[PDB]
Amino acid sequence: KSVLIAGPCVIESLENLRSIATKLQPLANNERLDFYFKASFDKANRTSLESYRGPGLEKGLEMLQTIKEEFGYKILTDVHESYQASVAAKVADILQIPAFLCRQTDLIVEVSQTNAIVNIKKGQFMNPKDMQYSVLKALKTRDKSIQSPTYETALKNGVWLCERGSSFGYGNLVVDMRSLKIMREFAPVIFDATHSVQMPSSFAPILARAAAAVGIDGLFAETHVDPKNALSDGANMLKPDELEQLVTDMLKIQNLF
Amino acid sequence: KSVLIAGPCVIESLENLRSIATKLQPLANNERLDFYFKASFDKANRTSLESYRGPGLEKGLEMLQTIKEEFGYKILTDVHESYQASVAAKVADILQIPAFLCRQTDLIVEVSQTNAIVNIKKGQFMNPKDMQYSVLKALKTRDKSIQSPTYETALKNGVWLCERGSSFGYGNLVVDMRSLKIMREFAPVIFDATHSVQMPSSFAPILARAAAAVGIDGLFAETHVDPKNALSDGANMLKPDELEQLVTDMLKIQNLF
């Protein structure tokens, strides 16, 4: 079953969380998908001190927990610092490690000590073959006998890799589709269709179709019921309708192979 | 006065710190230099779990304090977590923000709330003009009235930028010398000669000569008595004699302009 992770960039309020969770219900009920609801409790590196951060760890987890209970959703959130992982894992089913923190030992180990699936985002500065090292830190934390990171062992141990593109000069990200294949030797691979498009959004669907054809284990895409009124990533988020179309296309492509 | 920050990549032992400090003694007394001794208390991004980490914050700071006392040296060290800033500033005269963490708001704010100079390293994924936002978070923490970051104000309030190169494909960093000029409109600029060389330390001297000709406020270079027996970054460190040639050439070039 292919994975879909979807939800808003940041936790905005419980009411907005409920609205988007409600519009995701058809997709959450799709028998061909293993569905996870995403929302960030903290935006840690916004442009300005004044930019919206979200509710922070304790209140954010509370809100995600309410969504888990109200909708029966599995939950993904990202962590940023040590000492968040064990607390966040009581609520989140997947704990995502941000792209810039993908080589951070202590964080990888701490998240991997929890019961959560670990989703490690590949830094835009990384050679995909070098992601084997962060997979291995996570694997060794879970089974100390493991010497080499393979897809089968990583799947067994809930350790995933996530493609979000690579730095292509200044203010541009390029998705090297070769990386989807390279990384999948080491771990299941999720393609992030939201944060991989930077051109110095309309491309999210076509990149996701390409990724589905190459071969991936799932899709990450941020979604919001009224993106123009979003507090974070508003310009890059899909309408639930648009997300549905993209998933339909993914599933048709995957049904060929 | 031009800044020189020099020292080992990681604190290996007090014996090693004392050995490298002794060799740097002629440079530390150079009246044309404003000298800081550098050593990291923790290596956070190593290849494997078994990789040497360093003594850690508590013992690391104690060791850095011993060098400050014995050699009369001002101290630089890098910090990785918000919670480390307060205590590290009791020993460290400069607190450096690692390149991958150059957008992290809380770390920037916490370090800026100390009395330390803040050296903000430009991540390899960053457009150099974008570094203004990081300088501005730090400046606003120190002086709430400031609206846009400038060299003059950053100099006054102890907030610097550090060039360490940009991602150029996979496994490669290029130094765009245009960046030294671009960033210097926002803040004094330090050039990191040892972590800017990656090619898929021989190039350290030539890039530092280039940087000096362009216009920099200082140089950062890791140096070790016996790089071959180093516990970290041994491939890229300079011998103290190599560093001295590098500094001599930089000062000659700067004398010209």
Chain A residues within 8 A (CB-CB) of chain B? 44-49, 53, 80-82, 100-101, 103-106, 109, 123-127, 133, 136-137, 140-141, 166-167, 170-171
Q: Which of A53, A105, A140 is the closest to B44 by Cβ?
A: A105
Nearest chain A alpha carbon to B141? A49
CB atoms within 10 A of CB A230: 22
Q: Which residues of A touch B81 (CB under 8 A)?
A: 81-82
Instruction: Report angle CA B35, B41, B44 to the nearest 5 degrees.
Output: 120
Residue type, A128: P
CB atoms within 10 A of CB B202: 9
Domain limits, chain B: 1-257
Resolution in A: 1.9
Helix B57-71 and helix B14-23, axial crossing angle in degrees, nearest 10? 40
Residues with Cβ within 8 Å of B62's Cβ and at least 6 positions away in sequence, in order, are none
Instruction: Report angle CA B197, B198, B199 to the nearest 5 degrees.
Output: 110
3-state secondary structure of A229: helix
CA-to-CA dists, residue A42 to A60, A224, B134, angstroms = 8, 17, 18
Answer yes or no: do B44 and A125 touch at CB < 8 A: no
Superfamily of domain A1-257: Aldolase class I (3.20.20.70)
Per the CB < 8 A criterion, the answer to whether B177 and B219 are in contact is no
CA A215 remoteness from chain centre: 17
Q: How far apart are CA A57 and CA A64, in angstroms?
A: 10
Answer yes or no: do B127 and A170 touch at CB < 8 A: yes
Query: Residue B166 is encoded by which pair of tokens?
Result: 């940009």
Q: Which of A44, A103, A170 is the closest to B45 by Cβ?
A: A103
Whose tokens are 């507090």? That residue is: A231
